[PDB]
Write a protein that binds this ligand. Structure first.
Ligand SMILES: Nc1ncnc2c1ncn2[C@@H]1O[C@H](COP(=O)(O)OP(=O)(O)OP(=O)(O)O)[C@@H](O)[C@H]1O
Ligand SMILES: Nc1ncnc2c1ncn2[C@@H]1O[C@H](COP(=O)(O)OP(=O)(O)OP(=O)(O)O)[C@@H](O)[C@H]1O
Lengths: 403, 359, 96, 48, 187, 108
């Protein structure tokens, strides 16, 4: 039943490639990579990426779960194949994830690029929601994925996604990074990335940073500088931010223990209510300045809208199999606040239940674990789009072979 | 008792650790090269007859070939067994950094088909290196002879989502040192000659001021030129490669191949690791491998990790006095662990699941 | 706020169904059966405690339980129960 | 059938590798405890 | 002297009361359930080389009739449904294992006017029934149980009216409690 | 950790070894209980139960009934030689008695 294949989960934040049947992906590496015209070169594992090198250039291969630059996408694929996978593509099928809102044009183009360039024996393109459901062990339910670019509620029914029920919101890791930037600029915190620091000394809490700048820094572009700053900001997020249990109240937030954090440059300080006031926008964007818009939907609002836009007969199943995934879901008390809001807003007639896949591996790599267990099944061995299928039906056979 | 009968085999890019297990030291290590006619030999004989043999390393940054080569190294290692390998074979063999499915299955296939053993186990060299001491986690540098790694093995499990690697500090480091000696005036051009350059690492392996050590030492070159022993008696005061390319680990740009300096590479590994586990990653950073025998690696890793890490988290570096073979020692211990019996794979389950076993 | 009371009905029915696939048991018969189990448990445990106290031992062991079963069960039932207990204590310590 | 298997195998694997590194700590402890048992043997010779 | 030599508890209880050939190989194989002859690989044993694919039994696709051009023009004609739409509906039904909740989402609204789930289900069932009602000889499926769409529309409407009622749930539950109260009082 | 195995399954019994051990350890019986005592006790209890259930099912089939009722328990106990001695001083509700009519009180 098992067959040596290659499972790919190419997200806007990180790419996870590995073999089908393993509990974890072989290699997970950031997606927001740089570029250097050595021709354009790309890197993996973050060790060839976060290096000060001459003329770091900007690039965006995949945004919102969709390919933005086919050249950079092909380069990332080639590098993942020859550097970490270290195996010929013709020896292993390829099961790749895709965003539900991916277009037929991009689907067919990816299919033809995988069949005419790498000559893979079999190909399959599955949706991230279906993969998350298959990983969590449910064929019907609502997948809540809060990535770096968007927070999306996707209803899957019997293993198929209902496009008309999908809902998206831009409040995601990008919004959190913007809020962290604004908080730093308001608190007068100079965001210094590590590559600009030569040495530092220990300073008292709240005092200026005593650090020395490197003397032979190479030429780096504003894009690479912002990438390093966003990496630092994401570290700060994972180390500090926490979701409020209930609706954000300034009085209750001013009674919470502060969290100490030290930036790469040595500036160390404690954060109080400002670390809990930022993650509140994910659930209630009405209190976020610079976001003068009520049409934006919080996490619970997105969930409720996605459940409501579906047939009333299946809403009980969605409410009972609400699955939570994504990187942003790792913020402390995020799922607690989500469950509270969903129990408050959901009609008691429909049972509510959230899966407890709270581990980091279970959350961030859910879409890849799903593809792994889906390709490691004997039944799935009949859904493989073969090279002969591509040659006979053409690029358009993808739409009929893999919904 | 597979624990008492334990056996370990590690291929390696520079020296296979072939030796009987159960004790705390290897027995019959060998250069691990396979020679064939130019127009089969393995080990010391091939290393001697390199002049009339096309030599190959079955280790390609951890990758190996299945049908033809690795079986020769295994036959050469079979001396560790009591010449009765078809009966005395509770062996654990090389586990490349990360090529789990294909390499593990194809290797276990050969092992069970050639020996049909009642005891086998599959664990990445990282976990064996960590068992040399034993604690929550290790981010072992594991700089041996072919590659460098940052394996964050939390609680004895190698988290693959955070494993990072480095390639330039492997074999090509000897070629860079050969080019440095060419600039000096020796001008070697083949392995049969630069074997002595490889040996130079026995003394020319120190670094203090990663940013200006070589310049500051060329300015005051005295009591630092160890004068390695050349065969022809040329004891010229080697005093620049003493500090050039021990630092190439921390500064890949110094060689020409670009990558995160070994220190910042390990740092990025533990950064990509979990937040709470990152404290133990800082506190239990291990150093292992032949390349880690450089006396300055410990202090330089201390300094660089303290510069790159927060002030609250300290760096409790641990370099075993015999880190040369810490991986082998830990593997032998894990093998001859008393109550580890039940975890050995045997012919019993092989005859019904074969390589479809956990891999 | 539930006041859940335990019983041996889940295993008394498993043994019943394994020793008689086609025969069931009523609720009153199950209650009498659980009462019998409790009564014999009390008897054997008290006899083992008495043996321990007589031997001046503060802990009851499989040997005390074996002698208690030999004392309690009559004739050709004692031997059967003792062989069953011995076989179970040997199949349990063999890590199966 | 297979979904629960991976979830089970994960908890089992992290449990298996766990107890492995575990007896590893007990083994190292047993080596220090081995030296302590040698000291106890010295004390037993003392007693004899 | 005590023989023992065995486990303490078992020992006390007992006495105190007195040719290898079968290599696994990375073998190729074909799945008879497939029609494209795609060749895959598997770590089979040395005994079942070339044996049929065991999971091939899992190929019992859903049963969906296939009307012909003449049959459609004769009997399945409908003023509010064209071939371009009916063929697509049947294709979706065959592809997605006859689940109309998903067929409705996969419906091509860009070429055909919007549809609900009940109308699609009614159309499918009417097609299936009319295809076979032409003669009594067909034994596969003759009397397809065409579901009720009229009452289903109500079951949808007067239940969506209950779904999104926020305080009305509490109000109705409270009055139902009071209703049982005084009904028991007047019993 | 490793997949937890219950002591009842490990031994090969159905009765709750865990609950038997709990009762033994918290009861009047002793200060602390060994691991082997509750296994043995549960095994003996299970054997007695299997025996009496076999006899009750036999009585039920004899009476042409599919459900074991207290009649089938009383008849089984008072027909068996050893179980009768075991439960001589025990009365069973709604169990009845045997049709043991003395030969001296019969028609003559
Ligand atoms: N430990 C953590 N704690 C909190 N947030 C985290 C953590 N790790 C990652 N994140 C957040 O997760 C986001 C990216 O995660 P994820 O991998 O789910 O994105 P993706 O799904 O791969 O790509 P896309 O979001 O475009 O689909 C980042 O915005 C980052 O801030
Ligand atoms: N004492 C030492 N000081 C410096 N370098 C050393 C020392 N001993 C060995 N080396 C270098 O390290 C290399 C051997 O690496 P080591 O034995 O630690 O791991 P390895 O097994 O050789 O590598 P791999 O594990 O990839 O096979 C040799 O090529 C040698 O040049």
């Amino acid at each position: 039943d098992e067959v040596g294949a290659l499972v790919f989960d190419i997200g806007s934040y990180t790419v996870r490639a590995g073999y089908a049947g393993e509990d974890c992906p072989k290699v997970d590496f950031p997606t927001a990579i740089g570029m250097v015209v050595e021709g354009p070169t790309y890197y993996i594992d973050t060790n060839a990426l976060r290096v000060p090198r001459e003329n770091m250039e900007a690039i965006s291969p995949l945004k919102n779960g969709m390919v933005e630059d086919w050249d950079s996408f092909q380069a990332i694929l080639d590098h993942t194949y020859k550097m970490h996978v270290k195996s010929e593509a013709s020896l292993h099928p390829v099961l790749m994830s895709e965003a539900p809102w991916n277009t037929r044009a991009k689907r067919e183009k990816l299919t033809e690029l995988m069949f005419e360039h790498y000559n893979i024996p079999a190909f399959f393109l599955c949706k991230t929601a279906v993969l998350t459901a298959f990983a969590n062990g449910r064929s019907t339910g609502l997948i809540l994925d809060s990535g770096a670019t968007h927070t999306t509620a996707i209803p899957v029914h019997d293993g198929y996604v209902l496009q008309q029920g999908i809902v998206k919101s831009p409040l995601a890791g990008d919004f959190i990074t913007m809020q962290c930037r604004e908080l730093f600029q308001e608190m007068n915190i100079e965001l210094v990335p590590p590559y600009m620091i030569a040495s530092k000394e220990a300073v008292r809490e709240g005092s200026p940073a005593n650090w020395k700048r490197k003397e032979k820094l190479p030429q780096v572009t504003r894009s690479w500088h912002n990438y390093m700053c966003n990496c630092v900001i994401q570290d700060f997020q994972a180390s500090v931010l926490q979701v409020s249990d209930s609706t954000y109240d300034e009085q209750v937030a001013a009674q919470m223990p502060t969290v100490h954090y030290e930036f790469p440059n040595g500036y160390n300080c404690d954060f109080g209510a400002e670390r809990l006031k930022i993650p509140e926008g994910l659930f209630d964007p009405s209190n976020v300045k610079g976001l003068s818009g009520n049409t934006m939907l919080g996490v619970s609002h997105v969930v409720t809208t996605s459940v409501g836009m579906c047939d009333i007969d299946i809403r009980p199943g969605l409410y009972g199999s609400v699955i939570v995934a994504g990187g942003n879901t790792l913020i402390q008390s995020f799922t607690d606040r989500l469950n509270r809001e969903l129990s408050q807003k959901t009609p008691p007639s429909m049972r509510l239940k959230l899966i407890a896949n709270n581990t980091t591996v279970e959350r961030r790599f859910s879409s890849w674990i799903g593809g792994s267990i889906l390709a490691s099944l004997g039944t799935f061995q009949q859904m493989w789009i073969s090279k002969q299928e591509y040659e006979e039906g053409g690029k358009q056979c993808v739409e009929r072979k893999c919904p | 008792d597979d624990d008492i009968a334990a056996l370990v085999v590690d291929n390696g890019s520079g020296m296979c650790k072939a030796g009987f297990a159960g004790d705390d030291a290897p027995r019959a290590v060998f250069p691990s090269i396979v020679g064939r006619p130019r127009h089969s030999y393995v080990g010391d004989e091939a290393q001697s007859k390199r002049g009339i043999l096309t030599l190959k390393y079955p280790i390609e940054h951890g990758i190996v070939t299945n049908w033809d080569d690795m079986e020769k190294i295994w036959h050469h290692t079979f001396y560790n067994e009591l010449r009765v390998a078809p009966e005395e074979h509770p062996v654990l063999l090389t586990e490349a950094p990360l090529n789990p499915k294909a390499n593990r299955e194809k290797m276990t296939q050969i092992m069970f088909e050639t020996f049909n053993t009642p005891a086998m186990y599959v664990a990445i060299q990282a976990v064996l290196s960590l068992y040399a001491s034993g604690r929550t986690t290790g981010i072992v540098m594991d700089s041996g002879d072919g590659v460098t790694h940052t394996v964050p093995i939390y609680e004895g499990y190698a988290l693959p989502h955070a494993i990072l690697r480095l390639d330039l500090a492997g074999r090509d480091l000897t070629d860079y040192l050969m080019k440095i000696l060419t600039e000096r005036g020796y001008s070697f051009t083949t392995t049969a000659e630069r074997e002595i350059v490889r040996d130079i690492k026995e003394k020319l392996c120190y670094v203090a001021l990663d940013f200006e050590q070589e310049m500051a030492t060329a300015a005051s070159s005295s009591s630092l030129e160890k004068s390695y022993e050349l065969p022809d008696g040329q004891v010229i005061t080697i005093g620049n490669e003493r500090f050039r390319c021990p630092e190439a680990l921390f500064q890949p740009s110094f060689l020409g191949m670009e990558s995160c300096g070994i220190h910042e590479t390990t740092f990025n590994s533990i950064m990509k690791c979990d937040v709470d586990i990152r404290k133990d990653l800082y506190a239990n950073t291990v150093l292992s491998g032949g390349t880690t025998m450089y006396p300055g690696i410990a202090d330089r890793m201390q300094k660089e990790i303290t510069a790159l890490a927060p002030s609250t988290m300290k760096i409790k570096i641990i370099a075993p006095p015999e880190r040369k073979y810490s991986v082998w020692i830990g593997g032998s211990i894990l093998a001859s662990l008393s109550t580890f019996q039940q975890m050995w794979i045997s012919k019993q389950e092989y005859d019904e699941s074969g390589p479809s076993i956990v891999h | 706020k539930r006041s859940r009371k335990e019983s041996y009905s889940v295993y008394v029915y498993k043994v019943l169904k394994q020793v008689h696939p086609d025969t069931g048991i009523s609720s009153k018969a199950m209650g009498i059966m659980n009462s019998f189990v409790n009564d014999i448990f009390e008897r054997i445990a008290g006899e083992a405690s008495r043996l321990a106290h007589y031997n001046k031992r503060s802990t009851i062991t499989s040997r005390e339980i074996q002698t208690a079963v030999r004392l309690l069960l009559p004739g050709e039932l004692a031997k059967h129960a003792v062989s069953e207990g011995t076989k179970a204590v040997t199949k349990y310590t063999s890590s199966k | 059938w297979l979904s629960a298997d991976f979830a089970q195998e994960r908890r089992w694997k992290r449990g298996v590798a766990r107890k492995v590194v575990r007896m590893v700590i007990r083994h190292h402890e047993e080596q220090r405890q081995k030296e302590e048992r040698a000291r106890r043997e010295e004390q037993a010779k003392l007693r004899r | 002297k005590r023989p023992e030599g065995m486990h303490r508890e078992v020992y006390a209880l007992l006495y105190s009361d007195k040719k290898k050939v079968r290599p696994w190989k990375w073998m190729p194989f074909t799945n008879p359930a497939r029609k494209d002859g795609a060749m895959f690989f598997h770590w089979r044993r040395a005994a079942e080389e070339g044996k049929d694919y065991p999971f091939a039994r899992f190929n019992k696709t859903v049963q969906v009739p296939v009307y012909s051009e003449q049959e459609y023009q004769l009997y399945l004609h409908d003023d509010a449904w064209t071939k371009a739409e009916t063929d697509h509906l049947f294709d979706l039904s065959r592809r997605f294992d006859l689940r109309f909740v998903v067929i409705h989402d996969r419906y091509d609204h860009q070429q055909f006017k919007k549809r609900s789930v009940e109308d699609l289900k009614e159309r499918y069932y009417h097609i299936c029934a009319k295809l076979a009602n032409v003669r009594a000889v067909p034994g596969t499926d003759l009397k397809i149980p065409v579901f009720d769409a009229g009452h289903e529309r109500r079951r949808k409407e007067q239940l969506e009216r209950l779904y999104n009622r926020t305080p009305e749930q509490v109000a109705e539950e409270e009055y139902l409690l009071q209703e049982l109260r005084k009904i028991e009082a007047r019993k | 950790r490793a997949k937890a195995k219950s002591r009842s399954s490990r031994a090969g019994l159905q009765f709750p070894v865990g609950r038997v051990h709990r009762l033994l350890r918290k009861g009047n019986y002793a200060e602390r209980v060994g691991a082997g005592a509750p296994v043995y006790l549960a095994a003996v209890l299970e054997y007695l139960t299997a025996e009496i259930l076999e006899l009750a099912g036999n009585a039920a089939r004899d009476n042409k009934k599919t459900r074991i009722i207290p009649r089938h328990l009383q008849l089984a106990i008072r027909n068996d030689e050893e179980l009768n001695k075991l439960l001589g001083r025990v009365t069973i509700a709604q169990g009845g008695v045997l049709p043991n009519i003395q030969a001296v009180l019969l028609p003559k």
